[PDB]
Amino acid sequence: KSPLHFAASYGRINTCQRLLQDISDTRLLNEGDLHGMTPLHLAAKNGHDKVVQLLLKKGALFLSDHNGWTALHHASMGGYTQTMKVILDTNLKCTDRLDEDGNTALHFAAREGH
Amino acid sequence: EMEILKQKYRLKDLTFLLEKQHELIKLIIQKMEIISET
């Protein structure tokens, strides 16, 4: 629940390895925050790559939160190139998605000047 | 000109140090024994 959001939000790899050993449990990862943010977006925002790749190996399905932002969008704000390369090599269909107004991942990367 | 130039290099060194320190603190959270307040 909330501890999962906290731990995945700050790169606690060992705790993640511990508390998502339930393969049949799927709905908890696809949960939402008050803003609907999914752990993927949190780890992309807070500078962490191992956790997001571990969740991706589970098949995170690339959820989209409010304001239309996605995992690549949040990863862009912060210039963490490693998460970009580990999230782009899986699929090229995750670059042209669009947020609530029309900005893409490139828009935000240019905005933050990385 | 050379004084502003010196200030620019000192500020570049300061921001490099602060970036390293921020990465270090992120290292601090990513391995923590958060149990009492977990």
From Swiss-Prot, chain A:
Give start and end residues of every ANK repeat: 1-28, 35-64, 67-96
Q: How is it modified after translation?
A: TRPA1 activation by electrophiles occurs though covalent modification of specific cysteine residues in the N-terminal cytoplasmic domain. Hydroxylation is required for TRPA1 activity inhibition in normoxia. In hypoxia, the decrease in oxygen concentration diminishes the activity of the hydroxylase EGLN1, thus relieving TRPA1 from inhibition and ultimately leading to channel activation.
Where it sits in the cell: the answer is: Cell membrane
Return the similarity comment: Belongs to the transient receptor (TC 1.A.4) family.
Q: Which disease is it linked to?
A: Episodic pain syndrome, familial, 1: An autosomal dominant neurologic disorder characterized by onset in infancy of episodic debilitating upper body pain triggered by fasting, cold, and physical stress. The period of intense pain is accompanied by breathing difficulties, tachycardia, sweating, generalized pallor, peribuccal cyanosis, and stiffness of the abdominal wall. Affected individuals do not manifest altered pain sensitivity outside the episodes.
Q: What is known of its domains?
A: C-terminal helices from the four subunits associate to form atypical coiled coil structure; this region is probably involved in binding the inositol polyphosphates that are required for optimal channel activity (in vitro). The ANK repeat domain consists of a convex stem structure formed by five ANK repeats and 11 additional ANK repeats that form a crescent-shaped structure that surrounds the protein core.
Q: What does this protein do?
A: Ligand-activated Ca(2+)-permeable, nonselective cation channel involved in pain detection and possibly also in cold perception, oxygen concentration perception, cough, itch, and inner ear function. Has a relatively high Ca(2+) selectivity, with a preference for divalent over monovalent cations (Ca(2+) > Ba(2+) > Mg(2+) > NH4(+) > Li(+) > K(+)), the influx of cation into the cytoplasm leads to membrane depolarization. Has a central role in the pain response to endogenous inflammatory mediators, such as bradykinin and to a diverse array of irritants.
**Oligomer status and interactors:** Homotetramer. Interacts with TMEM100. Interacts with EGLN1. Interacts with the scorpion wasabi receptor toxin at the same site that electrophiles but in a non-covalent manner.
This protein's name: Transient receptor potential cation channel subfamily A member 1
Q: List the source organism.
A: Homo sapiens (Human)
Q: Give the organism's phylogenetic lineage.
A: Eukaryota, Metazoa, Chordata, Craniata, Vertebrata
Q: Which residues of the full protein are shown?
A: 447 to 560 of 1119
Curated annotation (Swiss-Prot), chain B:
Q: How is it modified after translation?
A: TRPA1 activation by electrophiles occurs though covalent modification of specific cysteine residues in the N-terminal cytoplasmic domain. Hydroxylation is required for TRPA1 activity inhibition in normoxia. In hypoxia, the decrease in oxygen concentration diminishes the activity of the hydroxylase EGLN1, thus relieving TRPA1 from inhibition and ultimately leading to channel activation.
Q: Where in the cell is it found?
A: Cell membrane
Coiled coil, from the record: 2-31
At the top level, the lineage of the source is Eukaryota
The UniProt annotation places a 1,2-diacyl-sn-glycero-3-phospho-(1D-myo-inositol) binding at 6-12
Q: What is known of its domains?
A: C-terminal helices from the four subunits associate to form atypical coiled coil structure; this region is probably involved in binding the inositol polyphosphates that are required for optimal channel activity (in vitro).
Q: How does it assemble?
A: Homotetramer. Interacts with TMEM100. Interacts with EGLN1. Interacts with the scorpion wasabi receptor toxin at the same site that electrophiles but in a non-covalent manner.
Q: What does this protein do?
A: Ligand-activated Ca(2+)-permeable, nonselective cation channel involved in pain detection and possibly also in cold perception, oxygen concentration perception, cough, itch, and inner ear function. Has a relatively high Ca(2+) selectivity, with a preference for divalent over monovalent cations (Ca(2+) > Ba(2+) > Mg(2+) > NH4(+) > Li(+) > K(+)), the influx of cation into the cytoplasm leads to membrane depolarization. Has a central role in the pain response to endogenous inflammatory mediators, such as bradykinin and to a diverse array of irritants.
Its family? Belongs to the transient receptor (TC 1.A.4) family.
State which disorder the record connects to this protein: Episodic pain syndrome, familial, 1: An autosomal dominant neurologic disorder characterized by onset in infancy of episodic debilitating upper body pain triggered by fasting, cold, and physical stress. The period of intense pain is accompanied by breathing difficulties, tachycardia, sweating, generalized pallor, peribuccal cyanosis, and stiffness of the abdominal wall. Affected individuals do not manifest altered pain sensitivity outside the episodes.
Q: What is this protein called?
A: Transient receptor potential cation channel subfamily A member 1
Origin organism of this chain? Homo sapiens
Q: Which residues of the full protein are shown?
A: 1041 to 1078 of 1119
